[PDB]
């Protein structure tokens, strides 16, 4: 047999309840946001497939990271890095 | 001239050169760029 | 020399800890969401 000692402050329990409620709700909402983001990307892969067939240059450049020149060999993209040219060294012909 | 194409086939690719079958390839044999925007959402850790 | 007076309630400190933890985590996740949204828009401009 024994005797049970009770703490005189319950604020640990109420704090636990508050934190648990907030954690559960925020985790739920963020899980939904993450799942929606995942589905959106898996969903827009189709737009990206059907845009690269219009002009592969822009899609390939924005995708790889560099500024590359690309073409399509069927179901793949063949790329090649583009060489920079200084701004001041261009002439536009008048006509 | 210069014809060479990859085509999606099964789970991999089939590679043709000059209108003649050359060989098959797996998906891993090609560098994969990504059209995905990463979102590394973690979760409120448990606390007691 | 002096003597230090201690408050009999620590709930300010635990409340500060709880709020700080929640603030840090929510701010981190929302920053990630905002950055991802930005990148998605800059990405769909194409």
UniProtKB/Swiss-Prot annotation, chain C:
Subcellular location: Virion membrane; Host cell membrane; Host endosome membrane; Host Golgi apparatus membrane
Domain of life: Viruses
PTM info: The cytoplasmic tail is phosphorylated by the viral kinase US3. Phosphorylation may be linked to a down-regulation of gB expression on cell surface. ubiquitinated.
Subunit structure, as described in the record: Homotrimer; disulfide-linked. Interacts with host receptor MYH9/NMMHC-IIA. Interacts with host receptor MYH10/NMMHC-IIB. Binds to heparan sulfate proteoglycans. Interacts with gH/gL heterodimer. Interacts with the host coreceptor PILRA.
UniProt similarity note: Belongs to the herpesviridae glycoprotein B family.
Function summary: Envelope glycoprotein that forms spikes at the surface of virion envelope and binds to the host cell entry receptors MYH9/NMMHC-IIA and MYH10/NMMHC-IIB, promoting the virus entry into host cells. Essential for the initial attachment to heparan sulfate moieties of the host cell surface proteoglycans. Involved in fusion of viral and cellular membranes leading to virus entry into the host cell: following initial binding to its host cell entry receptors, membrane fusion is mediated by the fusion machinery composed at least of gB and the heterodimer gH/gL.
Protein name: Envelope glycoprotein B
Biological source species: Human herpesvirus 1 (strain KOS)
